[model samples]
Target: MKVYITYGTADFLKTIVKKHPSENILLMQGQENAILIHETSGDTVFQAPHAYEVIDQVGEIKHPGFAVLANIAVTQEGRPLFENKFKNRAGKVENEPGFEAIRVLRPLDSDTYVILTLWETERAFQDWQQSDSYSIFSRPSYVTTYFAV
Candidate 1:
């Protein structure tokens, strides 16, 4: 089961990873969890074996929640009117079928960023990308164009 852990604030992840360095965790920072789908996809293609090793090796950490840092890109845009709003839409819009988990990190960013989720299986992650909610994102009008600083 491949899992994603989104840190609420900078270094929130480092605290955990520092303790357990042998986990198959991948940390990315960006606009939102939705955009993470891309990195997860591309990285998997080239690093599937490595990822599998982490997954196979780590198996399941007690989920102490480690954090890793990388420039991740997040985006918001979709029906429910506030896909990218980041704050008001979190918890509220998550878990509608394809979604698996949703959590908000405190004192991180005022935006109330989200960790919109899917599930354990990598295949499920792939299917979610092709899912209706994920697909709706590709439509020109449904996409957000915010430039990260």
Candidate 2:
């Protein structure tokens, strides 16, 4: 699997994908936030034990889909508030035809948060962006950087 690494001040989160030989964990120190991508058995990516800790929520299902990794910065209090609003309705998102899974994460010692979602295709992701749920969930306070894999 190919891992795309980015620089951020936030400390990397706890080791989550270690057990997988093909996994990639990238560490770039003293930046605002960092991103690590894992391309593995779609089913197990977000359900792993450590994954549960690093991610605020992990979707229950997986499929053959393209993935998006979004990095955002938010205050500590805003973290849970933002996560709750997003995860609360994420289940219905998984039920959407082209949606597969979604996972949320925050770096261990930084303010950077991450939202990773899998879709049947880029078109599916674009379609979701036009939905009311997307508009309601998107936060203006968040400064985001994204990657598609």
Candidate 3:
């Protein structure tokens, strides 16, 4: 699967839906910023969309808990280490409480690969953050949390 994401207010991003009527889009709204996620299997002929392929996924994503994204761009040499880190995993958080789903996103370009995880609640994610099985990428470009809207 391929996904596109853009940031803006609900009102502003609503126009995105208008442009592409009948598109199945998910909205994640934050206190200061809102994000629109468009997952599709077709061609992307739009503008301003950061494209990504769903390289790996576990569980299905449904409307419920909040979602967190970690943006980390790996260097050419570090790509192996990054991929290895994911490969040599033990699927620790897959059994965590309130854990819903996880997606390892790979960008088409040199953009950062995003690690998206869904939790039953913000508290669930916070607890995971404090746990030993947290860091997907040791150093992320940034992290953002948003609720389903």
Report the number of the highest-lDDT candidate: 3
Error of 2 at 117 (Å): 0.8
Please list the residue runs of candidate 2 whose C-alpha ends up more than 4 Å from where it truly belongs after superposition: 1-36, 39-52, 58-65, 135-149
Q: Which pairs of residues collide in candidate 3?
A: none
**What is the per-residue lDDT of model 1 for residues 63-116, given as tens digits with 9 covering 90 to 100?**
212221222222333323333344333233244333343332211222222233
lDDT of each: 0.31, 0.50, 0.78
lDDT of 3 by residue, 63-149 (tens): 646989988977666666676677777787778888988888887765588988888899988888899987334354988889977
Two-way lDDT contest, 1 vs 2, winner:
2
Candidate 1 deviant stretches above 4 angstroms? 1-99, 106-118, 135-149
C-alpha TM-score for every candidate: 0.27, 0.50, 0.82
Worst 10 residues of 1 by lDDT: 50-59
lDDT of 3: 0.78
